[PDB]
Every structure is written in C-alpha cells, then in structure tokens.
Design an enzyme around this catalytic site. Structure first.
Site, PDB file in Angstrom:
ATOM      1  N   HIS A  19     114.323  85.457  75.132  1.00  0.00           N
ATOM      2  CA  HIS A  19     116.633  85.480  74.635  1.00  0.00           C
ATOM      3  C   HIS A  19     116.772  85.695  73.321  1.00  0.00           C
ATOM      4  O   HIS A  19     115.019  85.315  72.766  1.00  0.00           O
ATOM      5  CB  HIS A  19     117.291  84.461  75.531  1.00  0.00           C
ATOM      6  CG  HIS A  19     116.143  83.355  75.078  1.00  0.00           C
ATOM      7  ND1 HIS A  19     115.339  82.531  76.237  1.00  0.00           N
ATOM      8  CD2 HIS A  19     116.596  82.008  74.462  1.00  0.00           C
ATOM      9  CE1 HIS A  19     115.368  81.332  76.206  1.00  0.00           C
ATOM     10  NE2 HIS A  19     115.932  81.416  74.868  1.00  0.00           N
TER      11      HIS A  19
HETATM   12  C1  LIG Z   1     115.741  74.148  74.973  1.00  0.00           C
HETATM   13  C2  LIG Z   1     116.581  72.745  76.316  1.00  0.00           C
HETATM   14  C3  LIG Z   1     116.276  73.526  77.062  1.00  0.00           C
HETATM   15  N1  LIG Z   1     116.586  72.806  78.394  1.00  0.00           N
HETATM   16  C4  LIG Z   1     117.221  72.689  79.437  1.00  0.00           C
HETATM   17  C5  LIG Z   1     117.492  74.387  80.446  1.00  0.00           C
HETATM   18  C6  LIG Z   1     116.227  74.193  81.591  1.00  0.00           C
HETATM   19  O1  LIG Z   1     116.521  74.124  82.333  1.00  0.00           O
HETATM   20  C7  LIG Z   1     115.016  74.272  80.449  1.00  0.00           C
HETATM   21  C8  LIG Z   1     114.109  75.267  79.452  1.00  0.00           C
HETATM   22  O2  LIG Z   1     115.365  75.616  79.019  1.00  0.00           O
HETATM   23  P1  LIG Z   1     114.680  77.332  78.325  1.00  0.00           P
HETATM   24  O3  LIG Z   1     113.897  77.842  78.718  1.00  0.00           O
HETATM   25  O4  LIG Z   1     115.568  77.687  77.137  1.00  0.00           O
HETATM   26  O5  LIG Z   1     116.174  78.512  79.844  1.00  0.00           O
HETATM   27  P2  LIG Z   1     115.235  79.398  80.271  1.00  0.00           P
HETATM   28  O6  LIG Z   1     113.732  78.319  81.490  1.00  0.00           O
HETATM   29  O7  LIG Z   1     116.293  79.505  81.308  1.00  0.00           O
HETATM   30  O8  LIG Z   1     114.180  80.295  79.957  1.00  0.00           O
HETATM   31  O9  LIG Z   1     114.995  73.132  79.961  1.00  0.00           O
HETATM   32  C9  LIG Z   1     117.685  71.745  78.100  1.00  0.00           C
HETATM   33  O10 LIG Z   1     118.224  70.668  78.902  1.00  0.00           O
HETATM   34  N2  LIG Z   1     117.726  70.881  76.871  1.00  0.00           N
HETATM   35  C10 LIG Z   1     117.464  72.180  75.753  1.00  0.00           C
HETATM   36  O11 LIG Z   1     117.464  71.416  74.220  1.00  0.00           O
END
Ligand SMILES: Cc1cn([C@H]2C[C@H](O)[C@@H](COP(=O)(O)OP(=O)(O)O)O2)c(=O)[nH]c1=O
Ligand SMILES: Cc1cn([C@H]2C[C@H](O)[C@@H](COP(=O)(O)OP(=O)(O)O)O2)c(=O)[nH]c1=O
Ligand SMILES: [Cl-]
Lengths: 135, 134
Positions: free
Chosen positions: B48
């Site tokens: 992303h």
């Molecule tokens: C980076 C980040 C992620 N998260 C959560 C969002 C998701 O549930 C998980 C992983 O986030 P992330 O890897 O950035 O998103 P994705 O898995 O969709 O690619 O952690 C938070 O709650 N706070 C944060 O600061």
C-alpha cells in the site's frame, strides 16, 4: 494500574502488532523515541530522575528488570512483552537491570534529550522529593 | 532518490543507544509509534501507499527486506541494523518481506491510524502518482 500500560495487541496469521498513539494510549505528546540494543555486561542503567520529562518504557524483545522509586514507595517490574508499557513520570527515580542479551528496550519521551533535566544523586532526588512535598 | 537515514549511535560497555527526535533527525512530527513482532508465515506485507502519512521504518531486531516505490524508482533495501531508518513519504508504496523469526519492525508515523489513507491497489497508486505529476 497507574504505571503499567497494557496496550491493545493485534494478532493475525502474519504476526503481532501494537500501535502507540500520542495522547491516546499514552498520556503525553511524543517528541523523541530512543532505544537500547546490543547490550552486554553486568553494570546497570538509569539511576536518575527527571524534573519534567515523561517516558514510557517498552521491552520490544527479550526482557529487562525495571525499578521505580517515587520517593515514597519502590516498585519493580520485569518487562518482557512488547504489549506492555511502563509509565515513568517526572520526579521518578528509575533504574534498568538484567537486560537479556537479545533485549531491545524502547522509550517514548515527552521531550528532546536534555542533559540538564537530570537528577543523578539519590539524596538530591530525595531532597527534591521532600521540597515538592512541602509545596 | 535516497530514503535511508543513518542515525548516530551511542556506544559504551553497556550496549548501544539511538535517539530519534521529531523534526530533528526525521522530517516530521511523531504522532504514532507502531511495531510488528512475533512474525510468522511466508506472506509478505505492506502493499500500500498513503496519501497523507509519512513514516520512518526501523528494524530493531533481526532483519527484513523492504521494497519502496516512489513512482519514479523502485528500491529494495534489507534492514538489519537498528541504526538505520527508511523514510517512507506520502505517495510511496511499500512492502515488507522476508521477516526473520526474531524480527522486530518499528515504525514512526506522522499521524494516527487511518484506514481511509490506504491506497491498496498498485495501479491506483500509479494513477495517483500520475495525477500528482500534473
Ligand atoms: C499500522 C496499524 C495497524 N493497525 C491494525 C490494522 C489491521 O487490523 C492490522 C494490520 O494493519 P496493516 O498491515 O497496516 O493493514 P493490512 O493488514 O490491511 O495490510 O493492524 C492498527 O490498529 N494500528 C496501526 O497503527
Ligand atoms: C537518552 C539519550 C542519551 N543521549 C546521549 C547522552 C550521552 O552522551 C549518551 C548516554 O546518555 P545516557 O546513556 O542516558 O547517560 P548515562 O551515561 O549517564 O547513563 O547518549 C542522547 O544523545 N540522546 C538521548 O535521547
Ligand atoms: Cl511481578
């Protein structure tokens, strides 16, 4: 209760994640992030207090034993979970002992490094504490 | 276009120390500090870009392979030293691969978590960039 912070942790097939947000799950604005790593020897760290600085200690890998002295009571805790933060307010003497060889200790601080904001003498700390009390 | 930050490191008989200061050795104010640990699986992550968020990635333990795409060039950099930070500006696609089992990845962010700031399709990232370009 007041010093130990249990951060919410996200776990999934890929691993674990913890997010610390200024003034959200920590009581202050973050201005500096420092960390200790590649540790060795049997001589400890800390042994001082701050007059204004606020901090939150987090053991990101391995473990470490921390001692807090607020001039009234002495508290001790072994940090060995990245989801656990320890709040160290102003006027709190602190020490860090027993860093595992793989230890990584992270600290979130309310202000930039400031050599002048240190109380390195226990008695002075004690005196300092006494004065604050009077007030 | 270089994105690597080499932080000054303090060394003594007790170990090493690195201090990151908002708007001092990083170009933004820190509002959030997140970290990934106890990693598993063979699936990489990231994939992303952000529209508003600025970040600095730091591998505090172990190692990981980071892919950054700023729309001009793609850079692959292995992080295995706590003294090195990788600046991920706005409009910069990122991916994290090959996490060591003992890896710890720490990220300094200019703002709070915001799912609406996630561009999740590489083509859209590319289009976004193109738009910016004009
Ligand atoms: C980076 C980040 C992620 N998260 C959560 C969002 C998701 O549930 C998980 C992983 O986030 P992330 O890897 O950035 O998103 P994705 O898995 O969709 O690619 O952690 C938070 O709650 N706070 C944060 O600061
Ligand atoms: C904590 C910290 C220390 N330092 C410097 C101050 C010293 O020159 C060195 C170590 O400070 P520190 O290790 O806390 O002091 P002491 O040796 O009394 O235990 O690193 C910074 O530059 N920034 C920081 O954020
Ligand atoms: Cl205990």
């Amino acid at each position: 209760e007041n010093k130990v912070i249990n951060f919410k942790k996200i776990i999934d097939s890929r691993g674990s994640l913890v997010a610390i947000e200024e003034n959200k799950n920590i009581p202050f604005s973050i201005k500096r992030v420092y960390y200790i790593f590649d540790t060795k020897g049997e001589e400890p760290r800390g042994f001082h207090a701050h007059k204004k600085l606020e901090q939150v200690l987090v053991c990101l890998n391995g473990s470490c034993r921390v001692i807090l002295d607020d001039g009234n009571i002495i508290q001790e805790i072994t940090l060995d979970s990245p989801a656990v933060g320890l709040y160290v307010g102003p006027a709190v003497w602190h020490e860090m002992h027993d860093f595992s060889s793989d230890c990584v200790m992270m600290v979130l601080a309310s202000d930039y490094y400031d050599e002048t904001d240190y109380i390195r003498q226990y008695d002075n700390f004690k005196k300092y504490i006494a004065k604050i009390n009077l007030e």
